[PDB]
Scaffold this active site. Sequence first.
Site, PDB file in Angstrom:
ATOM      1  N   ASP A  44      29.290  50.271  37.594  1.00  0.00           N
ATOM      2  CA  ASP A  44      30.323  49.238  37.715  1.00  0.00           C
ATOM      3  C   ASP A  44      30.806  48.764  36.345  1.00  0.00           C
ATOM      4  O   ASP A  44      31.988  48.444  36.181  1.00  0.00           O
ATOM      5  CB  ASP A  44      29.807  48.030  38.484  1.00  0.00           C
ATOM      6  CG  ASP A  44      29.733  48.252  39.995  1.00  0.00           C
ATOM      7  OD1 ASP A  44      30.503  49.082  40.539  1.00  0.00           O
ATOM      8  OD2 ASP A  44      28.927  47.524  40.632  1.00  0.00           O
ATOM      9  N   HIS A  99      31.764  37.466  38.013  1.00  0.00           N
ATOM     10  CA  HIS A  99      30.454  37.977  38.418  1.00  0.00           C
ATOM     11  C   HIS A  99      29.434  38.031  37.288  1.00  0.00           C
ATOM     12  O   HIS A  99      28.226  38.138  37.550  1.00  0.00           O
ATOM     13  CB  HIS A  99      30.568  39.402  39.009  1.00  0.00           C
ATOM     14  CG  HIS A  99      31.466  39.481  40.195  1.00  0.00           C
ATOM     15  ND1 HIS A  99      31.264  38.753  41.344  1.00  0.00           N
ATOM     16  CD2 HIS A  99      32.601  40.195  40.394  1.00  0.00           C
ATOM     17  CE1 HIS A  99      32.229  39.034  42.209  1.00  0.00           C
ATOM     18  NE2 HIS A  99      33.055  39.906  41.655  1.00  0.00           N
ATOM     19  N   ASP A 147      39.378  35.387  45.079  1.00  0.00           N
ATOM     20  CA  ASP A 147      39.138  36.839  45.008  1.00  0.00           C
ATOM     21  C   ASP A 147      38.462  37.318  46.314  1.00  0.00           C
ATOM     22  O   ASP A 147      37.798  36.543  47.003  1.00  0.00           O
ATOM     23  CB  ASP A 147      38.202  37.080  43.819  1.00  0.00           C
ATOM     24  CG  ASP A 147      38.057  38.518  43.427  1.00  0.00           C
ATOM     25  OD1 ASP A 147      38.627  38.901  42.383  1.00  0.00           O
ATOM     26  OD2 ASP A 147      37.263  39.245  44.068  1.00  0.00           O
ATOM     27  N   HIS A 151      35.816  38.962  46.539  1.00  0.00           N
ATOM     28  CA  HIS A 151      34.368  38.938  46.337  1.00  0.00           C
ATOM     29  C   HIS A 151      33.871  37.531  46.023  1.00  0.00           C
ATOM     30  O   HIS A 151      34.563  36.719  45.411  1.00  0.00           O
ATOM     31  CB  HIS A 151      34.011  39.867  45.175  1.00  0.00           C
ATOM     32  CG  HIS A 151      34.429  41.289  45.397  1.00  0.00           C
ATOM     33  ND1 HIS A 151      35.629  41.801  44.936  1.00  0.00           N
ATOM     34  CD2 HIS A 151      33.789  42.310  46.024  1.00  0.00           C
ATOM     35  CE1 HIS A 151      35.702  43.082  45.287  1.00  0.00           C
ATOM     36  NE2 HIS A 151      34.611  43.409  45.961  1.00  0.00           N
TER      37      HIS A 151
HETATM   38  K   LIG Z   1      36.190  34.549  46.197  1.00  0.00           K
HETATM   39 ZN   LIG Z   2      37.070  41.096  43.633  1.00  0.00          ZN
END
Ligand SMILES: [K+]
Ligand SMILES: [Zn+2]
EC number: 3.5.1.98
Lengths: 363, 5
Positions: free
Chosen positions: A88, A130, A165, A167
């Site tokens: 990633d 993240h 987002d 995620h």
């Molecule tokens: K989100």
């Molecule tokens: Zn995302």
Amino acid sequence: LVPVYIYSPEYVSMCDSLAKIPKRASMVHSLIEAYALHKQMRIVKPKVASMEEMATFHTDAYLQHLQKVSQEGDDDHPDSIEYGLGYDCPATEGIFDYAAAIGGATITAAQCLIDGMCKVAINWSGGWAHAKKDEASGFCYLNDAVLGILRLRRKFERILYVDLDLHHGDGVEDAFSFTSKVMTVSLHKFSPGFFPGTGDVSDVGLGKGRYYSVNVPIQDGIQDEKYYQICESVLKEVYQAFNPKAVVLQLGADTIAGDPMCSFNMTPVGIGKCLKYILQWQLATLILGGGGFNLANTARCWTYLTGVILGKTLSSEIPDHEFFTAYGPDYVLEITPSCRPDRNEPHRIQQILNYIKGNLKHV
Amino acid sequence: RHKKX
Ligand SMILES: [K+]
Ligand SMILES: [Zn+2]
Ligand SMILES: [K+]
């Protein structure tokens, strides 16, 4: 006054080198410029983040590792896995400097808000939510959102981070898990096996931060109307309970129909309604990008949202510009949803909303 | 740890 737009040609060229989104920063800027939106904004050159700035969140050992593998793009260093580098997050040559530029850009936006230069400051190449203190994650190397929030903490007492987002905004949530000065709100796909695997409605933060993290788990196929209903209901409750003084808003476009991740089924108009709701609070607001892997659609989305920030209605025809052919064969700004099912059941959404309301009573 | 990707 007018919104701040964080931009320089050199900055865009660095951001174009990110492994999972090559050329995206140029496409986004080019389309904004083609609609002449930059002429309605105050263009501010970003400053590079210093080591001292980066180290207020990231650990010395992680920063040192990133700097080492960045120098020659050593994507085969045996210690990269401890620090989250790998598939990633490859060790792209220069990635330490690119990430320091993006962190600096978000810090610069935050400083503009503190100085009262603007009420809205935009870094469309930021939003890398993240990354952890000691770990790259999810295409994120340095957490520019955390760095921006820590800069805003100089002045703005209570800060709301809203992450739209696809995620879960886990690195930002983790950074502030134990504090009540920053409330995090993330709407995201939540399904076992789906990255990063965290952010159930029962995840509310820890210790003195308990109830100062809000998570809204959503299933595949959500469209504009239902998404806005959810987002408005949550933000209304959050605003009343938390009384934020500043907002950081992450608008990753990987929710938009046509993304290869093919999970949510949103258009920029739905996200735009969420953005409008936040803007009407009239607070210092730092706007970030994030994911978005259909590059032309991500540019369509963020260009449209820039128009929302400016109160402008944009022409549907994509103007001539460097990447015009990327928008064929129809050459329009609007995005059409896919014909697939919305897997969100009304009773489940209502229960999530009720659970959140119960959590916010403690705030 | 999950893969994103
Ligand atoms: K989100
Ligand atoms: Zn995302
Ligand atoms: K918190």
